[PDB]
């Protein structure tokens, strides 16, 4: 299932794949998860994250 993303918290490479640590809109921080970049439909957040780090 797809869910609204509040913000990208962190980025990493694991097993050769880029993953983003996500805060989910309306869910607590305890539910943050690492998601492979192809799970994301968050062009604006990704571009903003990759621009500010």
């Amino acid at each position: 299932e797809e869910f609204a993303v509040e913000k990208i918290i962190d980025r990493r490479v694991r097993k050769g794949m880029v993953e983003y640590y996500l805060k989910w809109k309306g869910y607590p921080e305890t539910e943050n998860t690492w998601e492979p970049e192809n799970n994301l439909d968050c062009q604006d957040l990704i571009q903003q994250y990759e621009a500010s780090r």
């Binding site: 797809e2 993303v5 492979p36 994301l40």
Partner: peptide, 6 residues
Amino acid sequence: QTARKS
């Protein structure tokens, strides 16, 4: 602004 959750 969405993502698949695993």
